[PDB]
Structures are given as C-alpha cells and as structure tokens.
C-alpha cells in the first residue's frame, strides 16, 4: 500500500558523490527506522545501512545514510566501479510493526563513458499481422548510456496503460544498452486511432517516436 | 556462521500448489523472525509474509493473503511458505530472510508459474518507411532460444537482434533490425531466417517496402 519512492537511476563518475532519495510518509519513515540494501546481479540484497546511519561490519565508510522527516538518504562519496548496483531503502509502517516496505529501488551507474541518448525506432503493425487480427507496436530503443530508461505509450495524446510489456536493459556489442518495448493492441484500436507515441526518458531527456495508421 | 537455503521452488502452471523451504544453521533460528521476500525479474523486492520467533503470529502481503501460509519448524530449523492458488504474478525469486538489525539473506528459490508450452514463432516483417531500419517481429515462442539470422547470414553489418521480452503469458517475443542504405532498398533483397528448434520451426521471411 504504502510506498517508499527512490529515483530509478543516479550516476556519477568514479571518486564522485552521489545520493540517492527515499521519500515515504509520516506513517513509514517519519515512525521508523530506515536500512539500505545493496543487490549486485543475480544475488540477494546485501545489508549497508540499518538504523537510518549504522554500517554492519565491513560495509566500506563511504556509504553513509541519513534520515530526516519523511525522507531518508544514502550518500556514496567516491564512486567505485564495484558500487554499480541497485540499492533499495527499506522501512516499516507502523509502531512496532514487522511488514517491510522496500522502496521502489535505484540503478547505481559508475560513469564509464558519455552520457548517451537513445535511438528510438517505432514499428507500426505489419500487414500481415493486422490479417491476422493481432496488431503490435515495436518500440526498439538502443544505443543509451545509463542503461536506464522509461517507457510510456500514447494514444493520438492519451496515455496507453493496457497491453505493454517492457523489457529490462541490456548491454550491447558496443556496450551501450538496448531495451524493447511491445504494445498489443486489435486492429480495432490500431486504426481508430490517428496515431501511436512511444516516449522513451532518458536522463531526464525524452525522445518520441509517432507512428500512424494510414501512412503505407 | 549463518546459512539460509531456499528449495521448493520451479515451474508449475497457474491455480496449483507448491510449498517452499528454507534450511537454517549457525545461529539460534528459533530466537528469530522470519521474513520470505520476493523480486519478479527486473523488478523491486516485494515483503511477502512474517513470522514470529515461536510462531505465535504471522504477517502476510495483501497481495498474498488468503492464498499463502507461513510456518516454521524450531525442531528442524527450518522455515516454509505454503502457495496455493498460484498465478502469474507470482512468479518471482523468493528470498528467506532473518528479522532484526542484522538480517541475513538465503539465495533464493525461482518460482515460475506459467500455463506455457513448445510454441513456434509467428514471424511478421518490419518493413522500412541515407539510412533505413527494417527487421522482423519474432512473436510468441516458447522456450527460448531463437536465432535469427539475415539473407542466410550473408548479412551481418548493422544486424541488432534485441533480447526477446517474457510476456505476462509466459512466452517470448523478440525482434532482429537491420540499418541499411536507402539507395538499396529497392534494389537489394532482405530476408530474415528464424529458427526455433524446440519446435521445429524455420521460417523465412521476406520484409519489402510498405506499399499501398
């Protein structure tokens, strides 16, 4: 119910600082204690934080977290290759309460090369799956840097919330990421609409690409 | 030194149960809450339920409620998660997880429920509207792997076949785009050639310029 909001993305060099956010309520982090978890590729979240500022044994001193109000914070001064990884806050809701609520979560990316936008390519629906009675909008995005981005649909100006489904960045051959994304539509709504948008945010920049019915 | 072991886990089709383990050792697991949380693929960690030290009280998700049960067993340090009812959306990595200020987490069990089974592709060009980007759209297989490869592999430059996404539905869908001259396409001829073996599938698909 009840949810912790972190910004999906943050990035800085190597011996930067950077910080990330973890914005609740009054109930949640403004009542309770607030921990940080570090979550590398392929293996359960590692405990950096617990009572809003205390570091386990053999979590490095740069990572250093606050709390005040209803937000909390975790600071990495001096970025290391190794601190590429996502990093959830993790509070609770009531007084003595044992649920955990994790925030939504943050791609930590050490700066490696420019900053990159993405190449967007938007595929209408081709004939011979409309004569099928299955219409499928392509959303091919490449060649970004971070590899994080954020995918919204438009009808004509209208946003598409049923039918999309989104894949996780990649790495590419070139080492930029790569991302898909597929909005399933009938050919009823393909051609009752003048045109469909796939918005693509990256670093707070967005590239659209539109896309209509009657362009053969 | 603390170890948690996840098992129980795998793939089981939509409405149907399964019950998870989680083998504790190194400390007194019976003095200790526990947690099960999950995280879907590429998506945030997810509380699914608790239990008390002697359990005497358990918490669930409201997303869980009803359909899961959380015991333990001090006698055998151990902690279960009983599924029933299971769907889609509970397909995830389910994690076994200690209360307190220092937690310690297992690796994991991966559960996928899904009513998918050996699916062909259905292949659909991407046709072109100095460079142009045409492809095909690789949809609906199962399982994976797909190649796809260009004009039999005569052509390779500028060809980005994209990771294939896991739909809700189980099955996958990918798509193969290639940059090419404009000059060129109404020249040259571009064909695409998937191949599933799972299913014994190879097709070949012409993409030509959209024309009315």
């Known amino acids: 119910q009840s949810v912790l909001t972190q910004p999906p993305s943050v990035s800085g060099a190597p011996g930067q600082r950077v910080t990330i956010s973890c914005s609740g309520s009054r109930s949640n982090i403004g009542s309770n204690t607030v921990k940080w978890y570090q979550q590398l590729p392929g293996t359960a979240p590692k405990l950096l934080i617990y009572?809003?500022?205390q570091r386990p044994s053999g979590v490095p001193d740069r990572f250093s977290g606050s709390k005040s109000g209803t937000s909390a914070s975790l600071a990495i001064t001096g970025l290391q290759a190794e601190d590429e990884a996502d990093y959830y806050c993790?509070?609770?809701?009531?007084?003595?309460?044992?649920?955990?609520?994790f925030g939504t979560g943050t791609k930590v990316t050490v700066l490696g090369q420019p900053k990159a936008a993405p190449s967007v390519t938007l595929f209408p629906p081709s004939s011979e799956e409309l004569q099928a009675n299955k219409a499928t909008l392509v959303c091919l995005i490449s060649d970004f840097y971070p590899g994080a981005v954020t995918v919204a649909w438009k009808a004509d100006s209208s946003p598409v919330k049923a039918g999309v489904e989104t894949t996780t960045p990649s790495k590419q051959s070139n080492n930029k990421y790569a991302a898909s994304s597929y909005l399933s539509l009938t050919p009823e709504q393909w051609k009752s609409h003048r045109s469909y948008s796939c918005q693509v945010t990256h670093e707070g920049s967005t590239v659209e690409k539109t896309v209509a019915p009657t362009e053969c | 030194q603390v170890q948690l072991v996840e098992s129980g886990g795998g793939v089981v089709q939509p409405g149907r149960s399964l019950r998870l383990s989680c083998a504790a050792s190194?400390?007194?697991?019976?003095?200790?809450?526990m947690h099960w949380v999950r995280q879907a693929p590429g998506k945030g960690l997810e509380w699914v339920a608790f239990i008390r030290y002697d359990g005497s009280n358990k918490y669930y998700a409201d997303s869980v409620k009803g359909r899961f049960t959380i015991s333990r067993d001090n006698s055998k340090n151990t902690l279960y998660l009983q599924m029933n009812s299971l769907r889609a959306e509970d397909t995830a990595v389910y994690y076994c997880?200690?209360?307190?200020?220092?937690?310690?987490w297992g690796q994991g069990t991966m559960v996928t429920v899904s009513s998918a089974s050996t699916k062909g592709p259905s292949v659909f060009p991407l046709a072109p509207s100095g460079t142009a980007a045409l492809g095909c759209l690789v949809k609906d297989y199962f399982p994976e792997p797909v190649t796809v490869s260009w004009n039999s592999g005569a052509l390779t430059s500028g060809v980005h076949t994209f990771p294939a996404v896991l739909q809700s539905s189980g099955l996958y869908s990918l798509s193969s785009v290639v940059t090419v001259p404009s000059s060129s396409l109404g020249t040259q001829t571009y064909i695409c050639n998937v191949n599933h073996k799972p299913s014994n599938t190879k097709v070949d698909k012409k993409v030509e310029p959209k024309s009315c």
């Open positions: 009572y809003n500022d």
């Open positions: 993790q509070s609770y809701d009531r007084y003595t309460h044992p649920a955990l609520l």
């Open positions: 997880k200690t209360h307190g200020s220092h937690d310690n």
């Open positions: 190194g400390f007194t697991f019976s003095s200790y809450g």
